[PDB]
RNA sequence: GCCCGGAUAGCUCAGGGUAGAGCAGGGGAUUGAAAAUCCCCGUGUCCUUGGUUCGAUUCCGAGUCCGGGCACCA
RNA sequence: UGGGAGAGGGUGGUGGAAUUCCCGGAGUAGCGGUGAAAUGCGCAGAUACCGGGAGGAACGCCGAUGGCGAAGGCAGCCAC
RNA sequence: GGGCCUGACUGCGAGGCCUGCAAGCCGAGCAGGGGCGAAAGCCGGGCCUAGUGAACCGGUGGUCCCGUGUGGAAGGGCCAU
RNA sequence: UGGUGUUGGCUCUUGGUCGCGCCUGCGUAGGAUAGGUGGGAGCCUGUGAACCCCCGCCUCCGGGUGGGGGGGAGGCGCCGGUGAAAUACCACCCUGGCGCGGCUGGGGGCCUAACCCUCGGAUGGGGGGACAGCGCUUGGCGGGCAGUUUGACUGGGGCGGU
RNA sequence: CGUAGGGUUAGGCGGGACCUAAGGUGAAGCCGAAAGGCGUAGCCGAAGGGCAGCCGGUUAAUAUUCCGGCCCUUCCCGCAG
RNA sequence: GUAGGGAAACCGAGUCCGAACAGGGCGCAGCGGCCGCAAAGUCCGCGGCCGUGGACCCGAAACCGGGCGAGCUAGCCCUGGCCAGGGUGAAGCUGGGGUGAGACCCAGUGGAGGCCCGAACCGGUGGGGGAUGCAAACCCCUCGGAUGAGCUGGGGCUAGGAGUGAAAAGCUAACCGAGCCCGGAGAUAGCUGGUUCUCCCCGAAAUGACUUUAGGGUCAGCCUCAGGCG
RNA sequence: UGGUUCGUGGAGCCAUGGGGGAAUCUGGGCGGACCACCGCCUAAGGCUAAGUACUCCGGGUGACCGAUAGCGCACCAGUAC
RNA sequence: AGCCGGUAGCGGGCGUGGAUCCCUGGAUGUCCGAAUGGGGGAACCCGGCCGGCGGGAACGCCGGUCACCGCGCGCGCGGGGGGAACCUGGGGAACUGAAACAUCUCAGUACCCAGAGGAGAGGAAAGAGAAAUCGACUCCCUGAGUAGCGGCGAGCGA
């Protein structure tokens, strides 16, 4: 899953750290690391279809920023977008960011 | 999620009302079917702007209703007819009572907003109801005479 | 180390006001026998200790003993 | 030539009873089985009862000391 | 064998044995508060030589020593195990 | 594989806590079905009393009871008999049990509109359907793959022994 | 082999200004931290399809290429039907 | 450097343990006649040795990264080509017989097949030769397949923990139980080898203890030099 | 989960993939869990010389080499092979 | 005052009317290459449009123009590729060290990729951190192998 078109959120590199043992705070001798290895954390990217100037537009967006799509639809009403392609409509919507 | 209903909706609320729904319902049912709009800030004061405008245009229509309530319960319309002692030969219509008022006291008034079911065919003093909009009726005293 | 349990007759187990039940053991009926069956009979500090109650198997507290279950080990 | 009785044979169709299993409901402490029992099955809800479903095999009463076939053998009902 | 008892002490320790280190061992005497004995005195477990495990990490009871602007707290330290 | 996001609508049936209402509580002796302690010589009934019939009922099956049509001057306490504990009314509560309300949590049925698949027709139709898929997080299985470890003495090493 | 000079001649032979095969590439579109990976059409891609030349002579050295004879293809423009 | 003791608060020529004015641990004080010399200490230079670095030099088998390879070979894809000659003689079909009709039998025709013999082509069985070869796999004789799961030309696709494999861990450009190149990189090697002028004085050890230690180490023993003691 | 000296630690701070999700100075972040008090600073927009690094290039200078040395190459070398 | 490159020679020319030569600007600049009309096995092949050349319509040659993508209202402007090291950002090993090894180390190094430029980054406090103090960021010295971190090991290190 790539990349949020609204926020620019993007996959990140994280470690997966396996630990054994009992935490000092519970009276144990402490935690040991039994493995560290790389992994990725992905944006919760999802699809959002909206009809704008009679045209169907589709965003690939982190669930966090789903509401920011509809906000752009509102602010879009000031522009005249009819006659343009769905490609050119989206370009206009994203300049309003 | 708060939305402004653009229609009365079963067990949701009345038009112009601001109610609270699960996001999926609004953005997947209500909003794509023109049923409501997101209660954002921008189009929130719009609700205000239009509730204020209706409050105006109504209570105006309740004041151009009263500028003709005082100015019509404060006179009589005397209609000289031809008649023998009780009953008229012709009659007086709302249209009649209309052209007559627009003549003497020169007050334009609409015959169909005037409760004259049967045209007047006798002499005497008559009280008649006039509604230039509801809850603002107007009693008209009129004298048909020979 | 921590939590849940149990403990009641020879044996396995049921339960604020009873001490039960089955199976082992005994006699009786019955039979070629061995059983099944049928009558009766026993066999309790209900782990111990201190308190609740008018009273304790029961409630609470505390120990001993045996089960489980979770976790940790420089 | 005209007639008859018949589980004679072959093909296709199709009808109800019963058993089993599956689902739904209702219900609880046993069911099954034997000379007596035990294995088995059952609170993870069996047996017994009611509705639905699936499928195979055999055709109760009629039926008999009966009928048919050369014998082996042939039995729900229908058509050829 | 018996009576009374808890020295199977606390705070220290001259001087030695043994020895690569680190350990292991024996130890008079002084102070506190005791036990036994009339007293001299003895007593810091057991006739003796086996019955054991450095450090790190962590538990517990004390101590009130540090406490990240300050007062507390978290968490350490120290003594004991 | 649980939780949660994307993720919505309508129902049905549940469970858990919290608030209020109403009851349930029968060893023994005794008026009978006595929860605990406390208050307390009066509560009541025209703001409907003793018998009748519908019941939710709970019944240890003797009784308890609520609202109903009955119903038109009457009830039961202090009294006391044996009680460990008096009985009427009031009250805080205990073991339960619904009735409602609060937040909740679970299952079931449906729906369509997110998402998925499909349709020479595509702002649409059909199908699946809030499941699947995909994000974050939980625990598990996991030589399919990876990094490694697999002691020393020894009349050679292993084996045995230590 | 060393030095120097000379030698390879096409509308018809082979390939190109034609076709498409595996494959490759790739408007649309899809996907991936970046690099990139896919992808219908289309395009590319031959020893496959398609397409007009035979015989003889000539040079030291080329020849279906030059020459000789007899044949043929496409493109342009014109005339007739 | 001029103060140390204590875990620390802190005190201070002392401090820590301790109830202690106890004991103990770790600490505290130049040479000659105010001038001179010397000295703590410190700064620079020089030499020995140690730590960190590749650290005396040369040498692995390997591990990791990024690229280069299927013009060899293995499989598949697309498109073409090749297999002398001879032999055997399936089904079917025709006629004849047969029978109630049939099965079936006979002859003729026919030309099937991971059929037979054998060149090309593909192989590589046995022996001999070759063995600083003609040749980093060849030569002679012999032998297997040779219409098929056949052989072969051209165009393509799949590769390094990956491909491909009628399976041998085979093959993936003449050494594959993990290809090749460059890079990390001077990897690491407690091992083996090697270590370069002269003279002079002294001169070992091959034991002990501990050691994933035993042909390697740390301490001690034993050698050497400086200063001091006597 | 990363960054920092900080390897789960008493673990703050800075960053952020997932969930939940404010306020506009009487708002908000920080001073190493947390709380109080006392201070410091104003997040979620952007730009900004110089002082710093390097050496394909030019010049200057060596107790730098002097043809097995010095660059792989003093020479027709990233060549022949 | 000589000159026609290294390069002499054959055979021919030039220069005080200022050559050769050196410096700056300009003109010309086949084909390939980001390569960009299209294609392609780089340096070859095949085109459209406008204008020209030939006898020229077929055929050929000459000149001009024709890729994609981004941004602004078909028109413009911009991008693409390269550069020894250096720089920032996105990814990111292993040998080795720990006398075995996994956490740890090597190291955010090697390396891949994107981007930038003569530099790049950073930068005008939601800072520091105890001074009742300071006052953007960068770079050097020191603070300091300190504070700390650490199978409290090897080491790491403000
Ligand atoms: Mg995990
Ligand atoms: Mg603690
Ligand atoms: Mg850990
Ligand atoms: Mg750890
Ligand atoms: Mg992984
Ligand atoms: Mg998506
Ligand atoms: Mg959506
Ligand atoms: Mg839509
Ligand atoms: Mg989020
Ligand atoms: Mg959210
Ligand atoms: Mg009239
Ligand atoms: Mg306990
Ligand atoms: Mg007949
Ligand atoms: Mg059932
Ligand atoms: Mg059983
Ligand atoms: Mg059972
Ligand atoms: Mg049950
Ligand atoms: Mg069946
Ligand atoms: Mg007969
Ligand atoms: Mg004694
Ligand atoms: Mg005494
Ligand atoms: Mg001593
Ligand atoms: Mg010693
Ligand atoms: Mg000892
Ligand atoms: Mg004493
Ligand atoms: Mg004494
Ligand atoms: Mg005495
Ligand atoms: Mg004495
Ligand atoms: Mg003593
Ligand atoms: Mg003894
Ligand atoms: Mg350790
Ligand atoms: Mg410790
Ligand atoms: Mg403590
Ligand atoms: Mg303090
Ligand atoms: Mg503080
Ligand atoms: Mg305080
Ligand atoms: Mg204090
Ligand atoms: Mg402590
Ligand atoms: Mg502690
Ligand atoms: Mg403490
Ligand atoms: Mg999961
Ligand atoms: Mg969910
Ligand atoms: Mg549904
Ligand atoms: Mg459905
Ligand atoms: Mg739909
Ligand atoms: Mg529909
Ligand atoms: Mg539907
Ligand atoms: Mg659709
Ligand atoms: Mg649809
Ligand atoms: Mg649909
Ligand atoms: Mg789901
Ligand atoms: Mg969760
Ligand atoms: Mg997991
Ligand atoms: Mg395993
Ligand atoms: Mg393995
Ligand atoms: Mg697996
Ligand atoms: Mg493997
Ligand atoms: Mg080991
Ligand atoms: Mg050995
Ligand atoms: Mg040996
Ligand atoms: Mg041996
Ligand atoms: Mg020996
Ligand atoms: Mg020997
Ligand atoms: Mg030997
Ligand atoms: Mg052994
Ligand atoms: Mg020659
Ligand atoms: Mg020639
Ligand atoms: Mg010709
Ligand atoms: Mg042409
Ligand atoms: Mg072509
Ligand atoms: Mg083509
Ligand atoms: Mg591409
Ligand atoms: Mg595209
Ligand atoms: Mg591609
Ligand atoms: Mg394709
Ligand atoms: Mg073409
Ligand atoms: Mg091609
Ligand atoms: Mg082509
Ligand atoms: Mg061709
Ligand atoms: Mg063909
Ligand atoms: Mg051809
Ligand atoms: Mg041709
Ligand atoms: Mg011809
Ligand atoms: Mg000639
Ligand atoms: Mg020739
Ligand atoms: Mg010829
Ligand atoms: Mg000719
Ligand atoms: Mg014509
Ligand atoms: Mg100190
Ligand atoms: Mg003290
Ligand atoms: Mg002292
Ligand atoms: Mg002292
Ligand atoms: Mg000095
Ligand atoms: Mg040294
Ligand atoms: Mg080094
Ligand atoms: Mg050295
Ligand atoms: Mg390795
Ligand atoms: Mg390995
Ligand atoms: Mg690679
Ligand atoms: Mg390659
Ligand atoms: Mg091949
Ligand atoms: Mg090949
Ligand atoms: Mg072929
Ligand atoms: Mg053949
Ligand atoms: Mg043949
Ligand atoms: Mg043949
Ligand atoms: Mg023959
Ligand atoms: Mg043949
Ligand atoms: Mg013959
Ligand atoms: Mg024949
Ligand atoms: Mg023949
Ligand atoms: Mg035939
Ligand atoms: Mg025949
Ligand atoms: Mg034949
Ligand atoms: Mg044949
Ligand atoms: Mg054959
Ligand atoms: Mg033969
Ligand atoms: Mg053969
Ligand atoms: Mg054969
Ligand atoms: Mg043969
Ligand atoms: Mg061959
Ligand atoms: Mg061969
Ligand atoms: Mg051979
Ligand atoms: Mg032979
Ligand atoms: Mg041989
Ligand atoms: Mg050989
Ligand atoms: Mg040969
Ligand atoms: Mg031969
Ligand atoms: Mg031969
Ligand atoms: Mg042969
Ligand atoms: Mg042969
Ligand atoms: Mg053959
Ligand atoms: Mg043949
Ligand atoms: Mg074939
Ligand atoms: Mg082939
Ligand atoms: Mg082929
Ligand atoms: Mg080949
Ligand atoms: Mg090829
Ligand atoms: Mg490949
Ligand atoms: Mg393949
Ligand atoms: Mg490999
Ligand atoms: Mg590799
Ligand atoms: Mg493989
Ligand atoms: Mg093969
Ligand atoms: Mg090679
Ligand atoms: Mg090779
Ligand atoms: Mg090979
Ligand atoms: Mg091999
Ligand atoms: Mg390997
Ligand atoms: Mg490997
Ligand atoms: Mg290898
Ligand atoms: Mg190879
Ligand atoms: Mg090579
Ligand atoms: Mg490289
Ligand atoms: Mg490198
Ligand atoms: Mg290295
Ligand atoms: Mg090295
Ligand atoms: Mg080396
Ligand atoms: Mg090694
Ligand atoms: Mg070694
Ligand atoms: Mg050597
Ligand atoms: Mg040597
Ligand atoms: Mg000497
Ligand atoms: Mg000597
Ligand atoms: Mg020795
Ligand atoms: Mg030795
Ligand atoms: Mg050891
Ligand atoms: Mg060893
Ligand atoms: Mg050895
Ligand atoms: Mg060994
Ligand atoms: Mg040796
Ligand atoms: Mg060794
Ligand atoms: Mg030594
Ligand atoms: Mg000596
Ligand atoms: Mg010495
Ligand atoms: Mg001396
Ligand atoms: Mg002497
Ligand atoms: Mg970290
Ligand atoms: Mg951290
Ligand atoms: Mg860090
Ligand atoms: Mg820093
Ligand atoms: Mg931290
Ligand atoms: Mg804070
Ligand atoms: Mg914070
Ligand atoms: Mg924060
Ligand atoms: Mg975040
Ligand atoms: Mg405000
Ligand atoms: Mg403020
Ligand atoms: Mg605030
Ligand atoms: Mg903050
Ligand atoms: Mg701060
Ligand atoms: Mg603080
Ligand atoms: Mg601040
Ligand atoms: Mg602000
Ligand atoms: Mg900022
Ligand atoms: Mg800047
Ligand atoms: Mg700067
Ligand atoms: Mg230079
Ligand atoms: Mg120079
Ligand atoms: Mg030379
Ligand atoms: Mg050289
Ligand atoms: Mg020389
Ligand atoms: Mg030299
Ligand atoms: Mg150079
Ligand atoms: Mg050079
Ligand atoms: Mg050289
Ligand atoms: Mg050279
Ligand atoms: Mg050369
Ligand atoms: Mg001349
Ligand atoms: Mg001349
Ligand atoms: Mg001359
Ligand atoms: Mg002049
Ligand atoms: Mg001049
Ligand atoms: Mg120029
Ligand atoms: Mg081009
Ligand atoms: Mg191209
Ligand atoms: Mg033209
Ligand atoms: Mg001409
Ligand atoms: Mg022309
Ligand atoms: Mg042309
Ligand atoms: Mg052109
Ligand atoms: Mg590029
Ligand atoms: Mg550039
Ligand atoms: Mg860098
Ligand atoms: Mg970076
Ligand atoms: Mg990796
Ligand atoms: Mg690592
Ligand atoms: Mg490593
Ligand atoms: Mg390793
Ligand atoms: Mg190292
Ligand atoms: Mg190591
Ligand atoms: Mg090592
Ligand atoms: Mg190893
Ligand atoms: Mg390692
Ligand atoms: Mg690590
Ligand atoms: Mg390194
Ligand atoms: Mg690191
Ligand atoms: Mg980097
Ligand atoms: Mg580098
Ligand atoms: Mg500069
Ligand atoms: Mg700058
Ligand atoms: Mg500012
Ligand atoms: Mg600011
Ligand atoms: Mg300021
Ligand atoms: Mg600052
Ligand atoms: Mg200030
Ligand atoms: Mg300092
Ligand atoms: Mg560190
Ligand atoms: Mg480290
Ligand atoms: Mg670190
Ligand atoms: Mg580091």
């Amino acid at each position: 899953s790539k990349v949020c078109e609204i926020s620019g959120k993007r996959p990140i590199v994280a470690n997966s750290i396996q630990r054994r043992g009992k935490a000092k705070r519970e009276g144990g001798v402490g935690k040991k690391t039994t493995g560290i290895s790389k992994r990725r954390q992905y944006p919760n990217l999802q699809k959002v279809r909206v009809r704008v100037a009679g045209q169907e537009i589709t965003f690939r967006v982190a669930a966090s920023h789903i509401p920011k799509v509809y906000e752009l639809v509102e602010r879009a009403k000031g522009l005249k977008l009819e006659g343009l392609s769905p490609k050119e409509i989206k370009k206009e919507l994203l300049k309003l960011l | 999620m708060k939305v402004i209903l653009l229609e009365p909706l079963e067990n949701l609320g009345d038009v112009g009302q601001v109610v609270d729904v699960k996001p999926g319902y609004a953005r997947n049912y209500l909003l794509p079917r023109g049923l409501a709009v997101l209660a954002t800030e921008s189009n929130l004061k719009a609700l205000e702007a239009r509730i204020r405008a209706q409050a105006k245009r109504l209570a105006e229509r309740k004041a151009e209703a009263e500028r003709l309530k005082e100015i019509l319960e404060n006179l009589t319309l005397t209609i000289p007819v031809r008649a023998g002692e009780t009953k008229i030969y012709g009659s007086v219509t709302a249209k009649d009572i209309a052209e007559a008022l627009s003549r003497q006291h020169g007050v334009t008034i609409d015959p169909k907003r005037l409760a004259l079911e049967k045209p007047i065919k006798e002499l005497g003093e008559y009280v008649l109801t006039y509604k230039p909009h509801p809850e603002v009726p107007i009693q008209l005293k009129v004298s048909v005479v020979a």
Side-chain angles (χ1 to χ4, degrees), chain A residues 1-86 88-94 96-97, chain B residues 1-55 57-66 68-69 72-111 114-117 119-130 132-134 136-146:
Chain A
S1 312
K2 282 181 83 26
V3 165
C4 178
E5 303 171 332
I6 296 318
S7 74
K9 277 182 177 153
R10 152 171 315 272
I12 69 168
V13 179
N15 282 320
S16 185
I17 296 179
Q18 309 293 322
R19 319 192 182 257
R20 297 167 156 212
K22 187 193 293 182
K24 294 190 185 166
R25 91 167 41 233
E26 307 165 20
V29 288
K31 306 286 262 186
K32 311 301 190 153
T33 291
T34 223
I36 297 171
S37 81
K38 283 175 175 303
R39 55 147 305 187
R40 304 177 100 205
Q41 291 170 323
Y42 291 88
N44 198 3
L45 258 151
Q46 298 293 343
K47 297 192 172 175
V48 167
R49 299 184 296 112
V50 287
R51 165 108 22 197
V52 172
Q55 302 268 40
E56 200 201 275
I57 310 305
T58 40
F59 295 87
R60 300 177 69 243
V61 64
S64 77
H65 286 47
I66 296 198
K68 205 88 191 296
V69 172
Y70 295 86
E71 172 187 331
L72 286 180
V73 157
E74 300 298 59
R75 325 247 303 285
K77 284 191 247 178
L79 321 164
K80 194 180 205 70
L81 305 169
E82 285 84 345
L84 293 109
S85 59
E88 281 173 347
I89 290 173
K90 189 168 202 178
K91 289 215 227 174
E92 289 313 326
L93 291 168
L94 292 166
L96 290 174
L97 284 165
Chain B
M1 178 149 232
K2 288 169 276 63
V3 297
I4 327 161
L5 309 165
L6 295 193
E7 280 210 352
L9 270 151
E10 21 105 85
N11 304 64
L12 240 202
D14 172 62
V15 71
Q17 186 177 356
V18 164
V19 290
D20 193 354
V21 287
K22 283 158 157 171
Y25 192 45
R27 100 173 81 250
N28 286 324
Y29 183 76
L30 298 175
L31 265 68
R33 300 158 183 258
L35 294 198
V37 157
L38 38 174
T40 93
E41 224 247 355
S42 117
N43 60 20
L44 200 68
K45 35 171 84 172
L47 239 219
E48 290 207 26
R50 91 191 317 289
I51 299 160
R52 223 171 291 119
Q54 157 150 351
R57 182 180 29 68
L58 198 141
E60 150 56 37
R61 218 54 56 215
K62 201 148 222 136
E64 204 46 43
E66 299 290 347
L68 283 40
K69 167 132 175 298
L72 277 193
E73 299 170 356
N74 218 264
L75 36 68
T76 50
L77 190 62
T78 70
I79 312 98
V81 286
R82 289 186 56 82
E85 119 99 314
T86 285
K87 106 262 53 150
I88 303 194
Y89 286 100
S91 64
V92 35
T93 82
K95 171 265 209 183
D96 289 4
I97 313 184
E99 309 210 10
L101 179 48
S102 158
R103 146 181 303 94
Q104 304 169 9
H105 317 69
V107 172
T108 163
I109 271 321
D110 185 79
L114 179 52
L116 178 131
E117 55 162 357
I120 310 176
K121 270 268 303 185
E122 294 227 347
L123 242 21
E125 306 304 273
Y126 290 112
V127 74
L128 285 189
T129 8
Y130 189 64
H133 101 253
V136 188
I138 280 160
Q139 293 301 8
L140 226 192
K141 320 170 308 316
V142 276
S143 70
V144 286
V145 289

